[PDB]
Amino acid sequence: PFSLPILTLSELTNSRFPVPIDSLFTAQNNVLQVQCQNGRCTLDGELQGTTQLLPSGICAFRGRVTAQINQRDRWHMQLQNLNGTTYDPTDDVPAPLGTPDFKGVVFGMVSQRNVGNDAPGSTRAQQAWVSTYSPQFVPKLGSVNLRISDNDDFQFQPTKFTPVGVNDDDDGHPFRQWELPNYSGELTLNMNLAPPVAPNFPGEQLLFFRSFVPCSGGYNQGIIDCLIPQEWIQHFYQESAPSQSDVALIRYVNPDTGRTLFEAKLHRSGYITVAHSGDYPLVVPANGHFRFDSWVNQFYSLAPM
Amino acid sequence: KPFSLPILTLSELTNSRFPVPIDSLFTAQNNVLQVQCQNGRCTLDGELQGTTQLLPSGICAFRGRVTAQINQRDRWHMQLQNLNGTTYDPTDDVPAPLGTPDFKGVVFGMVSQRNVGNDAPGSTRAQQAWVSTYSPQFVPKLGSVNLRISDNDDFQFQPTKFTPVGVNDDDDGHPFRQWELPNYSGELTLNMNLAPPVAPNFPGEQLLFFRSFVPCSGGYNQGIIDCLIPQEWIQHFYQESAPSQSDVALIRYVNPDTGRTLFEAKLHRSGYITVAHSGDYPLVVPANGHFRFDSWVNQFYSLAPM
Ligand SMILES: C[C@@H]1O[C@@H](O[C@@H]2[C@@H](O[C@H]3O[C@H](CO)[C@H](O)[C@H](O)[C@H]3O)[C@@H](O)[C@@H](CO)O[C@@H]2O)[C@@H](O)[C@H](O)[C@@H]1O
Ligand SMILES: C[C@@H]1O[C@@H](O[C@@H]2[C@@H](O[C@H]3O[C@H](CO)[C@H](O)[C@H](O)[C@H]3O)[C@@H](O)[C@@H](CO)O[C@@H]2O)[C@@H](O)[C@H](O)[C@@H]1O
């Protein structure tokens, strides 16, 4: 029988950036498509897009630095899969699993640990940035280029990128959470994408699990919204409960009082809709959580949120 | 009601003592020095212990406000909150705020700030930082730690988060010692409310660890951090809260392709694993393998040699 894990918002991890969930948010419908590639999973447990299971994999890279070029995006990083295995560009994914799914700069740290004949075991780490606007951001082809703070202490050796936050670039390239990067560079279409999501019933809007992630300068709010949290993804992967219909009715409950605060539709393809009109940050008690009620269908009419 | 494990390969598991994937399994020779980590501690019926909390992103992280600086290497005084942003209570029955590092060394990563109130609200900044758990100002139980940062001219008295990236030895000699607990209340104080030490005491048995090689920031340290059970098992036991039928759950490492069992192990009620083996040994196992629950046995069950 299908179920959700029992977890409060502060016990949940954002599936599009590795931080806790801060709040719930419903957004007004708009012509601009929602088509994130991280945090995508069906209710019967099929991961989609660039989604993988580990919070520490989200927006991370692993590989070898193999060259440098005379450009701002200086250091060429040939990618592996996050578990260290060889990346195959012909696999049926948009990019290596964990790759960022938005336009912007991800900041964090790079670390290296030498192998082979040149000082094996020697290490180093420093601040780095990955711009997903860069012409050298071509993860589907098997590489990205890094900007680092100290060009004199970086070798052609195995490298990991650990994300900390996001920002706008300079030069007029803003942080746009709903714009997909070009995974294969400038004139090539993205492939094998998880499909766009949108409400289909009148009066319905998407409900998001929202985080305010760190930024590295200026005034950006750091908003990253996901469809379902990483812990639900991990749970659906395990259970693989056959979905009885296209829509699971779920209720947000206060476990202390025992009462239901509102209801929502959890769709088979892994997103939530609510009956509401307008942008609204939800105000709900800190102990609250969703519970599965019953299988319904597309025509089920939700009580207003 | 019936006990179980989540079905996950090693590359699908997260270290419960540092936020990275598991790299390998390791059994260690029995030693005089005790294992008493405070992160990654959970009973099989789902009671978290020590400084253990549920989120991989909480492990070795801090959250709070920077309130002062001092004329010492550990310069910036960070008054801590709980990781969810609520007020930290020093009289709570824990060794330290949940997520606090449980080893002697330096944790390196980044600090980030986001202003609130009257001074440029919304303005942000981030840079490299280090937290030494040897520091006399590392007093998380009392409610604060002091940070070293790379740029002392761009840091304010504002809400701050520390995100860990790796570990190292300090550069004045003080080594990275994963099995030595820090003093959570500083010099001349004893730790309280600790999760107990763990050790085998069936003859021929050794602890089995889930091992990760975490990033280091210079020199040759291997970055070894061993945990007793992975974060995903902790999360699973917390959800299930299955009553434990005996002191020991017999578990089998299986290859799901071939269908065969490769070795067996004892999963103890208090949340650690023992195997029948003599000597330090990095296990060699197929990449698709995973543990499965077999049955409830007792402390004196005799394991097939591994
Ligand atoms: C709001 C403001 O944003 C950040 O500062 C940036 C500038 O960043 C540069 O200058 C600051 C010094 O104030 C600092 O030295 C930093 O390391 C350096 O990169 C800069 O990008 C300008 C661009 O014209 O905009 C901002 O002022 C941040 O560092 C500040 O603390 C502050 O939050
Ligand atoms: C093994 C070595 O570890 C790190 O180097 C440090 C030394 O750092 C100094 O040298 C490196 C380059 O070799 C670099 O230029 C650095 O900025 C500079 O501070 C130094 O601290 C010594 C002291 O005993 O230890 C290490 O050698 C690392 O930077 C290196 O890349 C290299 O892996």
Side-chain angles (χ1 to χ4, degrees), chain A residues 267-296:
Chain A
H267 298 262
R268 181 186 262 144
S269 68
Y271 61 94
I272 300 171
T273 55
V274 290
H276 188 87
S277 175
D279 286 349
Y280 177 61
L282 282 70
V283 185
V284 280
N287 68 344
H289 61 260
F290 278 114
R291 295 298 301 261
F292 170 66
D293 179 290
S294 56
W295 294 101
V296 297

PDB file of all heavy atoms in Angstrom, chain A residues 267-296:
ATOM      1  N   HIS A 267       0.345  13.887  -7.964  1.00  0.00           N
ATOM      2  CA  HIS A 267       0.220  13.236  -9.257  1.00  0.00           C
ATOM      3  C   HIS A 267       1.229  12.090  -9.463  1.00  0.00           C
ATOM      4  O   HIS A 267       2.366  12.154  -8.981  1.00  0.00           O
ATOM      5  CB  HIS A 267       0.360  14.299 -10.331  1.00  0.00           C
ATOM      6  CG  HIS A 267      -0.706  15.346 -10.261  1.00  0.00           C
ATOM      7  ND1 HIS A 267      -1.830  15.312 -11.055  1.00  0.00           N
ATOM      8  CD2 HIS A 267      -0.829  16.442  -9.474  1.00  0.00           C
ATOM      9  CE1 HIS A 267      -2.595  16.354 -10.775  1.00  0.00           C
ATOM     10  NE2 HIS A 267      -2.003  17.063  -9.828  1.00  0.00           N
ATOM     11  N   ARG A 268       0.789  11.055 -10.182  1.00  0.00           N
ATOM     12  CA  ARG A 268       1.601   9.876 -10.500  1.00  0.00           C
ATOM     13  C   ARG A 268       3.024  10.226 -10.963  1.00  0.00           C
ATOM     14  O   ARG A 268       3.965   9.537 -10.609  1.00  0.00           O
ATOM     15  CB  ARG A 268       0.898   9.021 -11.574  1.00  0.00           C
ATOM     16  CG  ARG A 268       1.644   7.745 -11.956  1.00  0.00           C
ATOM     17  CD  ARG A 268       1.007   6.981 -13.114  1.00  0.00           C
ATOM     18  NE  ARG A 268       0.201   5.905 -12.550  1.00  0.00           N
ATOM     19  CZ  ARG A 268      -0.961   5.461 -13.028  1.00  0.00           C
ATOM     20  NH1 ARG A 268      -1.526   5.995 -14.104  1.00  0.00           N
ATOM     21  NH2 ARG A 268      -1.579   4.473 -12.396  1.00  0.00           N
ATOM     22  N   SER A 269       3.181  11.288 -11.736  1.00  0.00           N
ATOM     23  CA  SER A 269       4.493  11.630 -12.269  1.00  0.00           C
ATOM     24  C   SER A 269       5.385  12.424 -11.296  1.00  0.00           C
ATOM     25  O   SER A 269       6.521  12.755 -11.633  1.00  0.00           O
ATOM     26  CB  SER A 269       4.365  12.336 -13.616  1.00  0.00           C
ATOM     27  OG  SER A 269       3.790  13.601 -13.478  1.00  0.00           O
ATOM     28  N   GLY A 270       4.875  12.717 -10.101  1.00  0.00           N
ATOM     29  CA  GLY A 270       5.689  13.229  -8.992  1.00  0.00           C
ATOM     30  C   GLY A 270       5.674  14.730  -8.772  1.00  0.00           C
ATOM     31  O   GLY A 270       6.724  15.345  -8.612  1.00  0.00           O
ATOM     32  N   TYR A 271       4.489  15.329  -8.736  1.00  0.00           N
ATOM     33  CA  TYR A 271       4.357  16.739  -8.336  1.00  0.00           C
ATOM     34  C   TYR A 271       3.010  16.942  -7.654  1.00  0.00           C
ATOM     35  O   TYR A 271       2.124  16.090  -7.750  1.00  0.00           O
ATOM     36  CB  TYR A 271       4.495  17.680  -9.535  1.00  0.00           C
ATOM     37  CG  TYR A 271       3.447  17.477 -10.602  1.00  0.00           C
ATOM     38  CD1 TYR A 271       2.284  18.236 -10.617  1.00  0.00           C
ATOM     39  CD2 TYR A 271       3.621  16.530 -11.601  1.00  0.00           C
ATOM     40  CE1 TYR A 271       1.322  18.058 -11.597  1.00  0.00           C
ATOM     41  CE2 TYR A 271       2.655  16.342 -12.586  1.00  0.00           C
ATOM     42  CZ  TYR A 271       1.510  17.103 -12.581  1.00  0.00           C
ATOM     43  OH  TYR A 271       0.563  16.906 -13.565  1.00  0.00           O
ATOM     44  N   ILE A 272       2.867  18.077  -6.981  1.00  0.00           N
ATOM     45  CA  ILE A 272       1.690  18.349  -6.156  1.00  0.00           C
ATOM     46  C   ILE A 272       0.921  19.558  -6.672  1.00  0.00           C
ATOM     47  O   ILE A 272       1.524  20.565  -7.062  1.00  0.00           O
ATOM     48  CB  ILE A 272       2.083  18.629  -4.698  1.00  0.00           C
ATOM     49  CG1 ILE A 272       2.802  17.419  -4.117  1.00  0.00           C
ATOM     50  CG2 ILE A 272       0.847  18.963  -3.863  1.00  0.00           C
ATOM     51  CD1 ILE A 272       3.429  17.668  -2.767  1.00  0.00           C
ATOM     52  N   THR A 273      -0.408  19.455  -6.678  1.00  0.00           N
ATOM     53  CA  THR A 273      -1.245  20.623  -6.967  1.00  0.00           C
ATOM     54  C   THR A 273      -2.215  20.902  -5.833  1.00  0.00           C
ATOM     55  O   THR A 273      -2.651  20.002  -5.144  1.00  0.00           O
ATOM     56  CB  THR A 273      -2.050  20.476  -8.268  1.00  0.00           C
ATOM     57  OG1 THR A 273      -2.833  19.281  -8.228  1.00  0.00           O
ATOM     58  CG2 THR A 273      -1.114  20.458  -9.473  1.00  0.00           C
ATOM     59  N   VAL A 274      -2.557  22.170  -5.687  1.00  0.00           N
ATOM     60  CA  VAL A 274      -3.533  22.613  -4.689  1.00  0.00           C
ATOM     61  C   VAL A 274      -4.538  23.556  -5.345  1.00  0.00           C
ATOM     62  O   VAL A 274      -4.241  24.169  -6.365  1.00  0.00           O
ATOM     63  CB  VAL A 274      -2.856  23.341  -3.514  1.00  0.00           C
ATOM     64  CG1 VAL A 274      -2.057  22.356  -2.667  1.00  0.00           C
ATOM     65  CG2 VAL A 274      -1.988  24.497  -4.001  1.00  0.00           C
ATOM     66  N   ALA A 275      -5.712  23.677  -4.734  1.00  0.00           N
ATOM     67  CA  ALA A 275      -6.745  24.608  -5.191  1.00  0.00           C
ATOM     68  C   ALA A 275      -6.542  25.981  -4.552  1.00  0.00           C
ATOM     69  O   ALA A 275      -6.895  26.202  -3.396  1.00  0.00           O
ATOM     70  CB  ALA A 275      -8.130  24.064  -4.853  1.00  0.00           C
ATOM     71  N   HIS A 276      -5.957  26.899  -5.307  1.00  0.00           N
ATOM     72  CA  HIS A 276      -5.670  28.231  -4.797  1.00  0.00           C
ATOM     73  C   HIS A 276      -5.384  29.152  -5.955  1.00  0.00           C
ATOM     74  O   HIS A 276      -4.982  28.690  -7.016  1.00  0.00           O
ATOM     75  CB  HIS A 276      -4.464  28.178  -3.858  1.00  0.00           C
ATOM     76  CG  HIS A 276      -4.201  29.465  -3.140  1.00  0.00           C
ATOM     77  ND1 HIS A 276      -4.812  29.792  -1.949  1.00  0.00           N
ATOM     78  CD2 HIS A 276      -3.397  30.508  -3.449  1.00  0.00           C
ATOM     79  CE1 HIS A 276      -4.389  30.982  -1.553  1.00  0.00           C
ATOM     80  NE2 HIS A 276      -3.532  31.436  -2.448  1.00  0.00           N
ATOM     81  N   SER A 277      -5.590  30.450  -5.743  1.00  0.00           N
ATOM     82  CA  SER A 277      -5.321  31.464  -6.750  1.00  0.00           C
ATOM     83  C   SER A 277      -4.338  32.507  -6.209  1.00  0.00           C
ATOM     84  O   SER A 277      -4.657  33.228  -5.262  1.00  0.00           O
ATOM     85  CB  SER A 277      -6.640  32.146  -7.146  1.00  0.00           C
ATOM     86  OG  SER A 277      -6.427  33.211  -8.045  1.00  0.00           O
ATOM     87  N   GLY A 278      -3.150  32.581  -6.814  1.00  0.00           N
ATOM     88  CA  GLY A 278      -2.134  33.581  -6.460  1.00  0.00           C
ATOM     89  C   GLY A 278      -0.894  33.012  -5.789  1.00  0.00           C
ATOM     90  O   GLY A 278      -0.944  31.924  -5.204  1.00  0.00           O
ATOM     91  N   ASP A 279       0.215  33.754  -5.884  1.00  0.00           N
ATOM     92  CA  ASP A 279       1.437  33.437  -5.140  1.00  0.00           C
ATOM     93  C   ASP A 279       1.161  33.533  -3.656  1.00  0.00           C
ATOM     94  O   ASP A 279       0.670  34.552  -3.181  1.00  0.00           O
ATOM     95  CB  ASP A 279       2.567  34.414  -5.466  1.00  0.00           C
ATOM     96  CG  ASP A 279       3.176  34.188  -6.835  1.00  0.00           C
ATOM     97  OD1 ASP A 279       2.897  33.167  -7.488  1.00  0.00           O
ATOM     98  OD2 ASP A 279       3.955  35.056  -7.264  1.00  0.00           O
ATOM     99  N   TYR A 280       1.483  32.475  -2.921  1.00  0.00           N
ATOM    100  CA  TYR A 280       1.241  32.445  -1.502  1.00  0.00           C
ATOM    101  C   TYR A 280       2.254  31.555  -0.767  1.00  0.00           C
ATOM    102  O   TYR A 280       2.279  30.345  -0.984  1.00  0.00           O
ATOM    103  CB  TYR A 280      -0.175  31.941  -1.237  1.00  0.00           C
ATOM    104  CG  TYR A 280      -0.483  31.824   0.233  1.00  0.00           C
ATOM    105  CD1 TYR A 280      -0.439  32.941   1.071  1.00  0.00           C
ATOM    106  CD2 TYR A 280      -0.813  30.603   0.790  1.00  0.00           C
ATOM    107  CE1 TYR A 280      -0.712  32.844   2.425  1.00  0.00           C
ATOM    108  CE2 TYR A 280      -1.090  30.497   2.140  1.00  0.00           C
ATOM    109  CZ  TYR A 280      -1.031  31.615   2.953  1.00  0.00           C
ATOM    110  OH  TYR A 280      -1.301  31.473   4.297  1.00  0.00           O
ATOM    111  N   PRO A 281       3.076  32.154   0.118  1.00  0.00           N
ATOM    112  CA  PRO A 281       3.876  31.386   1.065  1.00  0.00           C
ATOM    113  C   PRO A 281       2.993  30.860   2.183  1.00  0.00           C
ATOM    114  O   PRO A 281       2.405  31.651   2.915  1.00  0.00           O
ATOM    115  CB  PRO A 281       4.880  32.414   1.616  1.00  0.00           C
ATOM    116  CG  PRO A 281       4.786  33.605   0.731  1.00  0.00           C
ATOM    117  CD  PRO A 281       3.401  33.591   0.164  1.00  0.00           C
ATOM    118  N   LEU A 282       2.884  29.540   2.310  1.00  0.00           N
ATOM    119  CA  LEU A 282       1.987  28.948   3.286  1.00  0.00           C
ATOM    120  C   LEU A 282       2.460  29.197   4.722  1.00  0.00           C
ATOM    121  O   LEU A 282       3.650  29.146   5.009  1.00  0.00           O
ATOM    122  CB  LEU A 282       1.814  27.449   3.059  1.00  0.00           C
ATOM    123  CG  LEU A 282       0.866  27.032   1.932  1.00  0.00           C
ATOM    124  CD1 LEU A 282       1.455  27.362   0.568  1.00  0.00           C
ATOM    125  CD2 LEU A 282       0.544  25.541   2.034  1.00  0.00           C
ATOM    126  N   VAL A 283       1.510  29.445   5.613  1.00  0.00           N
ATOM    127  CA  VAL A 283       1.802  29.547   7.034  1.00  0.00           C
ATOM    128  C   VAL A 283       1.109  28.364   7.716  1.00  0.00           C
ATOM    129  O   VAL A 283      -0.114  28.242   7.732  1.00  0.00           O
ATOM    130  CB  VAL A 283       1.420  30.922   7.619  1.00  0.00           C
ATOM    131  CG1 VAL A 283       1.852  31.019   9.080  1.00  0.00           C
ATOM    132  CG2 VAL A 283       2.079  32.027   6.799  1.00  0.00           C
ATOM    133  N   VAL A 284       1.923  27.448   8.222  1.00  0.00           N
ATOM    134  CA  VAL A 284       1.445  26.184   8.770  1.00  0.00           C
ATOM    135  C   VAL A 284       2.263  25.850  10.009  1.00  0.00           C
ATOM    136  O   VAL A 284       3.413  26.298  10.131  1.00  0.00           O
ATOM    137  CB  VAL A 284       1.603  25.040   7.749  1.00  0.00           C
ATOM    138  CG1 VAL A 284       0.480  25.074   6.725  1.00  0.00           C
ATOM    139  CG2 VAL A 284       2.951  25.127   7.050  1.00  0.00           C
ATOM    140  N   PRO A 285       1.683  25.077  10.938  1.00  0.00           N
ATOM    141  CA  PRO A 285       2.411  24.747  12.162  1.00  0.00           C
ATOM    142  C   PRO A 285       3.643  23.897  11.883  1.00  0.00           C
ATOM    143  O   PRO A 285       3.639  23.073  10.943  1.00  0.00           O
ATOM    144  CB  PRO A 285       1.386  23.983  13.001  1.00  0.00           C
ATOM    145  CG  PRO A 285       0.310  23.576  12.061  1.00  0.00           C
ATOM    146  CD  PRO A 285       0.283  24.620  10.986  1.00  0.00           C
ATOM    147  N   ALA A 286       4.682  24.109  12.695  1.00  0.00           N
ATOM    148  CA  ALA A 286       6.000  23.505  12.467  1.00  0.00           C
ATOM    149  C   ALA A 286       5.997  21.986  12.521  1.00  0.00           C
ATOM    150  O   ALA A 286       6.835  21.353  11.895  1.00  0.00           O
ATOM    151  CB  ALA A 286       7.014  24.058  13.465  1.00  0.00           C
ATOM    152  N   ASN A 287       5.052  21.405  13.257  1.00  0.00           N
ATOM    153  CA  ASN A 287       4.938  19.956  13.375  1.00  0.00           C
ATOM    154  C   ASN A 287       4.175  19.251  12.240  1.00  0.00           C
ATOM    155  O   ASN A 287       4.019  18.034  12.270  1.00  0.00           O
ATOM    156  CB  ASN A 287       4.305  19.586  14.726  1.00  0.00           C
ATOM    157  CG  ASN A 287       2.845  20.005  14.840  1.00  0.00           C
ATOM    158  OD1 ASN A 287       2.349  20.825  14.070  1.00  0.00           O
ATOM    159  ND2 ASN A 287       2.152  19.438  15.815  1.00  0.00           N
ATOM    160  N   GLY A 288       3.709  19.998  11.247  1.00  0.00           N
ATOM    161  CA  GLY A 288       2.801  19.431  10.242  1.00  0.00           C
ATOM    162  C   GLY A 288       3.496  18.559   9.212  1.00  0.00           C
ATOM    163  O   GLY A 288       4.694  18.709   8.959  1.00  0.00           O
ATOM    164  N   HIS A 289       2.736  17.637   8.620  1.00  0.00           N
ATOM    165  CA  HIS A 289       3.248  16.797   7.544  1.00  0.00           C
ATOM    166  C   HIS A 289       2.119  16.257   6.669  1.00  0.00           C
ATOM    167  O   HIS A 289       0.964  16.180   7.105  1.00  0.00           O
ATOM    168  CB  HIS A 289       4.066  15.637   8.125  1.00  0.00           C
ATOM    169  CG  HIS A 289       3.276  14.731   9.013  1.00  0.00           C
ATOM    170  ND1 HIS A 289       3.325  14.812  10.388  1.00  0.00           N
ATOM    171  CD2 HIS A 289       2.409  13.733   8.728  1.00  0.00           C
ATOM    172  CE1 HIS A 289       2.522  13.905  10.910  1.00  0.00           C
ATOM    173  NE2 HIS A 289       1.945  13.245   9.925  1.00  0.00           N
ATOM    174  N   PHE A 290       2.459  15.874   5.442  1.00  0.00           N
ATOM    175  CA  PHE A 290       1.499  15.227   4.538  1.00  0.00           C
ATOM    176  C   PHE A 290       1.294  13.748   4.881  1.00  0.00           C
ATOM    177  O   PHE A 290       2.218  13.075   5.342  1.00  0.00           O
ATOM    178  CB  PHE A 290       1.958  15.333   3.088  1.00  0.00           C
ATOM    179  CG  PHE A 290       1.635  16.637   2.433  1.00  0.00           C
ATOM    180  CD1 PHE A 290       2.640  17.503   2.045  1.00  0.00           C
ATOM    181  CD2 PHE A 290       0.311  16.997   2.183  1.00  0.00           C
ATOM    182  CE1 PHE A 290       2.342  18.705   1.431  1.00  0.00           C
ATOM    183  CE2 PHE A 290       0.011  18.189   1.572  1.00  0.00           C
ATOM    184  CZ  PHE A 290       1.024  19.043   1.184  1.00  0.00           C
ATOM    185  N   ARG A 291       0.068  13.264   4.680  1.00  0.00           N
ATOM    186  CA  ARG A 291      -0.266  11.839   4.802  1.00  0.00           C
ATOM    187  C   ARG A 291      -1.070  11.430   3.577  1.00  0.00           C
ATOM    188  O   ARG A 291      -1.872  12.213   3.076  1.00  0.00           O
ATOM    189  CB  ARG A 291      -1.130  11.557   6.032  1.00  0.00           C
ATOM    190  CG  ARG A 291      -0.457  11.813   7.373  1.00  0.00           C
ATOM    191  CD  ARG A 291       0.762  10.928   7.599  1.00  0.00           C
ATOM    192  NE  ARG A 291       0.453   9.495   7.544  1.00  0.00           N
ATOM    193  CZ  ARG A 291       0.252   8.706   8.600  1.00  0.00           C
ATOM    194  NH1 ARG A 291       0.326   9.181   9.843  1.00  0.00           N
ATOM    195  NH2 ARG A 291      -0.026   7.419   8.410  1.00  0.00           N
ATOM    196  N   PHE A 292      -0.863  10.202   3.109  1.00  0.00           N
ATOM    197  CA  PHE A 292      -1.651   9.665   2.002  1.00  0.00           C
ATOM    198  C   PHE A 292      -3.067   9.352   2.494  1.00  0.00           C
ATOM    199  O   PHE A 292      -3.239   8.782   3.556  1.00  0.00           O
ATOM    200  CB  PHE A 292      -1.005   8.401   1.422  1.00  0.00           C
ATOM    201  CG  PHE A 292      -1.888   7.668   0.443  1.00  0.00           C
ATOM    202  CD1 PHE A 292      -2.231   8.251  -0.767  1.00  0.00           C
ATOM    203  CD2 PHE A 292      -2.364   6.399   0.731  1.00  0.00           C
ATOM    204  CE1 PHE A 292      -3.037   7.581  -1.674  1.00  0.00           C
ATOM    205  CE2 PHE A 292      -3.174   5.723  -0.171  1.00  0.00           C
ATOM    206  CZ  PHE A 292      -3.508   6.320  -1.375  1.00  0.00           C
ATOM    207  N   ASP A 293      -4.067   9.757   1.725  1.00  0.00           N
ATOM    208  CA  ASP A 293      -5.460   9.483   2.070  1.00  0.00           C
ATOM    209  C   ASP A 293      -5.989   8.335   1.213  1.00  0.00           C
ATOM    210  O   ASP A 293      -6.277   7.259   1.730  1.00  0.00           O
ATOM    211  CB  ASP A 293      -6.313  10.731   1.871  1.00  0.00           C
ATOM    212  CG  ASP A 293      -7.776  10.482   2.207  1.00  0.00           C
ATOM    213  OD1 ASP A 293      -8.454   9.747   1.461  1.00  0.00           O
ATOM    214  OD2 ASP A 293      -8.246  11.010   3.231  1.00  0.00           O
ATOM    215  N   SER A 294      -6.089   8.566  -0.096  1.00  0.00           N
ATOM    216  CA  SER A 294      -6.723   7.610  -1.000  1.00  0.00           C
ATOM    217  C   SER A 294      -6.357   7.893  -2.449  1.00  0.00           C
ATOM    218  O   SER A 294      -5.914   8.992  -2.784  1.00  0.00           O
ATOM    219  CB  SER A 294      -8.250   7.686  -0.855  1.00  0.00           C
ATOM    220  OG  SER A 294      -8.701   9.014  -1.071  1.00  0.00           O
ATOM    221  N   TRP A 295      -6.571   6.906  -3.315  1.00  0.00           N
ATOM    222  CA  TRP A 295      -6.381   7.108  -4.754  1.00  0.00           C
ATOM    223  C   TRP A 295      -7.656   7.672  -5.357  1.00  0.00           C
ATOM    224  O   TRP A 295      -8.732   7.122  -5.153  1.00  0.00           O
ATOM    225  CB  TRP A 295      -6.019   5.791  -5.444  1.00  0.00           C
ATOM    226  CG  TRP A 295      -4.699   5.234  -5.029  1.00  0.00           C
ATOM    227  CD1 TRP A 295      -4.476   4.217  -4.145  1.00  0.00           C
ATOM    228  CD2 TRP A 295      -3.413   5.655  -5.486  1.00  0.00           C
ATOM    229  NE1 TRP A 295      -3.135   3.988  -4.018  1.00  0.00           N
ATOM    230  CE2 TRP A 295      -2.457   4.860  -4.826  1.00  0.00           C
ATOM    231  CE3 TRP A 295      -2.976   6.636  -6.378  1.00  0.00           C
ATOM    232  CZ2 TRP A 295      -1.088   5.001  -5.052  1.00  0.00           C
ATOM    233  CZ3 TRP A 295      -1.606   6.782  -6.592  1.00  0.00           C
ATOM    234  CH2 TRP A 295      -0.688   5.973  -5.939  1.00  0.00           C
ATOM    235  N   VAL A 296      -7.518   8.772  -6.091  1.00  0.00           N
ATOM    236  CA  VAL A 296      -8.629   9.441  -6.750  1.00  0.00           C
ATOM    237  C   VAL A 296      -8.250   9.575  -8.223  1.00  0.00           C
ATOM    238  O   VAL A 296      -7.380   8.860  -8.709  1.00  0.00           O
ATOM    239  CB  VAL A 296      -8.950  10.812  -6.102  1.00  0.00           C
ATOM    240  CG1 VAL A 296      -9.382  10.621  -4.657  1.00  0.00           C
ATOM    241  CG2 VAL A 296      -7.756  11.769  -6.178  1.00  0.00           C
TER     242      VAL A 296
END
